Amino acid sequence: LIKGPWTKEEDQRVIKLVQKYGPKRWSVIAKHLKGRIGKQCRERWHNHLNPE
Numbered sequence: 001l002i003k004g005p006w007t008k009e010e011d012q013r014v015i016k017l018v019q020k021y022g023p024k025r026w027s028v029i030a031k032h033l034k035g036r037i038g039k040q041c042r043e044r045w046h047n048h049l050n051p052e
């Protein structure tokens with residue numbers, strides 16, 4: 001599956017998964033999110049959820 005814009009639910013899940021696995025292991029994190037691959041989760045984290 002392929003998803004477009006991120007939902008608030010997805011964002012919250014990414015936050016919880018990063019807490020569990022660390023801001024890495026993106027492939028593992030992505031396995032829990034339907035329609036998302038590792039790089040998408042990585043970019044969402046660095047650009048939107050935890051910006052510098």
Ligand code: NA
Pocket residue numbers: 030031032033034035036037
């Ligand atoms: Na996925």
